Design an enzyme around this catalytic site. Sequence first.
Site, PDB file in Angstrom:
ATOM      1  N   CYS A  88       5.750   0.095  10.534  1.00  0.00           N
ATOM      2  CA  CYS A  88       5.100  -0.982  11.266  1.00  0.00           C
ATOM      3  C   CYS A  88       6.126  -1.954  11.832  1.00  0.00           C
ATOM      4  CB  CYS A  88       4.142  -1.758  10.352  1.00  0.00           C
ATOM      5  SG  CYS A  88       2.548  -0.971  10.079  1.00  0.00           S
ATOM      6  N   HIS A  98       7.287   1.077   5.407  1.00  0.00           N
ATOM      7  CA  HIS A  98       6.370   0.133   6.035  1.00  0.00           C
ATOM      8  C   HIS A  98       7.258  -0.892   6.672  1.00  0.00           C
ATOM      9  CE1 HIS A  98       2.295   0.944   4.142  1.00  0.00           C
ATOM     10  NE2 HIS A  98       3.093   1.818   3.556  1.00  0.00           N
ATOM     11  N   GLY A  99       6.687  -2.006   7.125  1.00  0.00           N
ATOM     12  CA  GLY A  99       7.522  -3.029   7.730  1.00  0.00           C
ATOM     13  C   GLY A  99       6.941  -4.034   8.710  1.00  0.00           C
ATOM     14  N   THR A 145       0.835  -1.203   0.000  1.00  0.00           N
ATOM     15  CA  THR A 145       0.000   0.000   0.000  1.00  0.00           C
ATOM     16  C   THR A 145       0.866   1.248   0.000  1.00  0.00           C
ATOM     17  OG1 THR A 145      -0.122   0.555   2.355  1.00  0.00           O
ATOM     18  CG2 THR A 145      -1.437  -1.313   1.584  1.00  0.00           C
TER      19      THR A 145
HETATM   20  C1  0ZZ Z   1       2.587  -0.503   8.332  1.00  0.00           C
HETATM   21  O1  0ZZ Z   1       3.878  -0.793   7.761  1.00  0.00           O
HETATM   22  C2  0ZZ Z   1       1.529  -1.274   7.523  1.00  0.00           C
HETATM   23  S1  0ZZ Z   1       1.572  -3.038   7.827  1.00  0.00           S
HETATM   24  C3  0ZZ Z   1       3.168  -3.462   7.177  1.00  0.00           C
HETATM   25  C4  0ZZ Z   1       3.223  -4.873   6.663  1.00  0.00           C
HETATM   26  C5  0ZZ Z   1       4.414  -5.395   6.169  1.00  0.00           C
HETATM   27  C6  0ZZ Z   1       4.492  -6.719   5.722  1.00  0.00           C
HETATM   28  C7  0ZZ Z   1       3.359  -7.526   5.769  1.00  0.00           C
HETATM   29  C8  0ZZ Z   1       2.168  -7.011   6.255  1.00  0.00           C
HETATM   30  C9  0ZZ Z   1       2.098  -5.696   6.698  1.00  0.00           C
HETATM   31  C10 0ZZ Z   1       2.311   1.010   8.163  1.00  0.00           C
HETATM   32  C11 0ZZ Z   1       3.502   1.819   8.666  1.00  0.00           C
HETATM   33  C12 0ZZ Z   1       3.615   3.152   7.987  1.00  0.00           C
HETATM   34  O2  0ZZ Z   1       2.933   4.088   8.411  1.00  0.00           O
HETATM   35  O3  0ZZ Z   1       4.375   3.266   7.016  1.00  0.00           O
HETATM   36  N1  0ZZ Z   1       1.097   1.395   8.884  1.00  0.00           N
HETATM   37  C13 0ZZ Z   1      -0.046   1.687   8.258  1.00  0.00           C
HETATM   38  O4  0ZZ Z   1      -0.162   1.677   7.026  1.00  0.00           O
HETATM   39  C14 0ZZ Z   1      -1.240   2.031   9.167  1.00  0.00           C
HETATM   40  N2  0ZZ Z   1      -2.360   2.724   8.516  1.00  0.00           N
HETATM   41  C15 0ZZ Z   1      -2.703   3.979   8.814  1.00  0.00           C
HETATM   42  O5  0ZZ Z   1      -2.093   4.653   9.630  1.00  0.00           O
HETATM   43  C16 0ZZ Z   1      -3.903   4.574   8.089  1.00  0.00           C
HETATM   44  C17 0ZZ Z   1      -5.152   4.679   8.946  1.00  0.00           C
HETATM   45  C18 0ZZ Z   1      -5.369   5.798   9.772  1.00  0.00           C
HETATM   46  C19 0ZZ Z   1      -6.506   5.884  10.595  1.00  0.00           C
HETATM   47 BR1  0ZZ Z   1      -6.729   7.356  11.821  1.00  0.00          BR
HETATM   48  C20 0ZZ Z   1      -7.427   4.836  10.564  1.00  0.00           C
HETATM   49  C21 0ZZ Z   1      -7.223   3.730   9.754  1.00  0.00           C
HETATM   50  C22 0ZZ Z   1      -6.083   3.623   8.943  1.00  0.00           C
HETATM   51  O6  0ZZ Z   1      -5.832   2.400   8.216  1.00  0.00           O
HETATM   52  C23 0ZZ Z   1      -5.842   2.364   6.756  1.00  0.00           C
HETATM   53  C24 0ZZ Z   1      -1.712   0.704   9.783  1.00  0.00           C
HETATM   54  C25 0ZZ Z   1      -2.713   0.959  10.871  1.00  0.00           C
HETATM   55  C26 0ZZ Z   1      -2.312  -0.169   8.701  1.00  0.00           C
END
Ligand code: 0ZZ
EC number: 3.4.22.56
Lengths: 140, 140, 91, 91
Positions: A130, A88-89, A29
Site C-alpha cells: 500500500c 503492507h505500507g 492484518t
Molecule cells: C495495504 O498495505 C493495506 S493498508 C496499509 C496501512 C499501513 C499503515 C496504516 C494503515 C494502513 C495492503 C497492501 C498489501 O497487499 O500488502 N493492501 C490490502 O491489504 C488490500 N486488501 C486486499 O487486497 C483484500 C481485498 C480484496 C478484494 Br477483491 C476486496 C476487498 C479486500 O479488502 C479486505 C487493501 C484494499 C486493504
Amino acid sequence: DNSYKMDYPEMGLCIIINNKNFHKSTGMTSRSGTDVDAANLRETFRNLKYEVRNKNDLTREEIVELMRDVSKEDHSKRSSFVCVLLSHGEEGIIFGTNGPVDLKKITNFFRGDRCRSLTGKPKLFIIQACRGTELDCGIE
Amino acid sequence: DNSYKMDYPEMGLCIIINNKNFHKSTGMTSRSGTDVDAANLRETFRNLKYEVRNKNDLTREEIVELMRDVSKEDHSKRSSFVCVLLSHGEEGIIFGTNGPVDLKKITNFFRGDRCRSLTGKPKLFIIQACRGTELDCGIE
Amino acid sequence: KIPVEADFLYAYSTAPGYYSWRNSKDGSWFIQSLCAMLKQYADKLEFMHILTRVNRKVATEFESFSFDATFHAKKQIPCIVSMLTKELYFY
Amino acid sequence: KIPVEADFLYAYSTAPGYYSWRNSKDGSWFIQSLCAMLKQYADKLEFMHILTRVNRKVATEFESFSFDATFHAKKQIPCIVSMLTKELYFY
Ligand SMILES: *[C@@](O)(CSCc1ccccc1)[C@H](CC(=O)O)NC(=O)[C@@H](NC(=O)Cc1cc(Br)ccc1OC)C(C)C
Ligand SMILES: *[C@@](O)(CSCc1ccccc1)[C@H](CC(=O)O)NC(=O)[C@@H](NC(=O)Cc1cc(Br)ccc1OC)C(C)C
C-alpha cells in the site's frame, strides 16, 4: 550503447523479501497469498539466471541488516540487482514484522557511491504494498 | 493495441506555463533562461502538430483557473495533452508568481472522471523545477 | 470502467528531494536535452525509450560549476513516472 | 563521474496515496500480471515496454469485489518510476 550491459558471468541476485505475518502488537492484518506471489516471482526470476533468496517475515531492524549485508558484497561480476518487496505500507514507508521503516534509507545502501560494484548497473526495486489509503473508483 | 491511439483530426494541445519573475515578497529568485527553454519547447512541440499556448508569470490562483479552464474543454477530437511547467519548487509543490501551489490539485482536473474527452488519452506533465533541496555529488 | 490515475505520465527534471539545474544562458539541463532528443528521435523511437536518453544525456554530459564550495561539482538525474497504459509514438 | 540516484528503477504496484489490491487466493494483482508478462515477453520486448502492459493488464482486466459498500468496485494502476540511463533487455 542505448541498451544496458547484460552479459557478465552472472546475471544477477534477485532478493524477494516476503513479509506476511505481522506481529499482533502492530495491529497489522495478514497478507493472504503473498506466498503465491513470492512463489511465482521466485520462479519467474529463477527462469532468467537470478540467485533468488526468499526471506520471510523479517523485521524492519532485520530488513535493513539484510540490505546493509547485500550492498556490502562483491557484485563486481554481476549484471544487475532485483529487489522484490512484499508487505503492507504507507507512502514512502514499508512494513517489517514489528513496525514501519522507510523505503529511502533502504535503497540508500545501493546509491552510486555506496554500492560500488553496482554502479552503472540497474538496481530494480519492485515493491508490492500500500502507498497510502485512497480508493480508485474508475470511470468509462 | 500495445501502442496508444494517435491519429485524430488534431494531435494535441501543448500548454507551456513559463514562470520566471517571482513577486519580490515571496523572496523567490529569478529563473535566468526559462525563455530559452519555453522558446525551444514551444518550437519542439509546434513541430509535431500541437496547439502550444505559452503563458507567463501566472500566479498559483491563476494557474489553477487556467487548468480548470483547459480541462473544461472539448478534447473529443484530440490525441493527447502535454503540459509543460517551468518554475521553482519543493517536492509536490509548484510555484506561482505569489506563492506555492500543489502539483496534485492541478493534475486532478484531468483525472479520468474529471476530464472526460481526455480518457484513454495520454496526459503528459513535463515539470521543470526543484523537487526539494538535496545535492547530487555523483561518483566514479 | 478503468482507473482514473492511469494514462498519466510525469517526466520530472530531477529525482525526488533534489535540486534541478538550469543554465543562466542556454536553459534547463533536462529541458534542452529533452527537445534535443525529441528532435532526432521523435520519429524513430517510442517515448519512454526517448525519455531514457534524456536522462542519459543529462547524467552523462552535464555537471554543475560554481565558486560556492557548496554548489560546485553537482549532478542531476531526471525522473520518468508513468501511469500510461500503452506505448506512445509521435505520428 | 555520474549521478548516484541514476540507474535506479521503482515499479510500484499502485500509484501514490492509493491502496494496493492483492487476492486472498491467487496473489497480488500487479504481482501476477507481472510474472505473467515477464513470462511471454521477457525475450521479445524491452522492460519499460514490458512494464506498460503490466499496468495495462491491471487497469483493464482487474477490479475489486466486496460486501463493503466502501471497498467494492475499485481499480488499481501500478506506477513505473525510472532513473535508469539505458534500456534493459533480459538476455
Ligand atoms: C495495504 O498495505 C493495506 S493498508 C496499509 C496501512 C499501513 C499503515 C496504516 C494503515 C494502513 C495492503 C497492501 C498489501 O497487499 O500488502 N493492501 C490490502 O491489504 C488490500 N486488501 C486486499 O487486497 C483484500 C481485498 C480484496 C478484494 Br477483491 C476486496 C476487498 C479486500 O479488502 C479486505 C487493501 C484494499 C486493504
Ligand atoms: C529550484 O526551484 C530552486 S530551490 C526552490 C525552493 C523552493 C522553496 C524553498 C526553497 C527553495 C530551481 C528550479 C528551477 O530551475 O526553476 N533551481 C535553481 O534555481 C538551481 N540553480 C541553478 O541552476 C543556477 C546555477 C547553475 C550552475 Br552551472 C551553478 C550554480 C547555480 O546556482 C545559483 C538550484 C541549483 C539552486
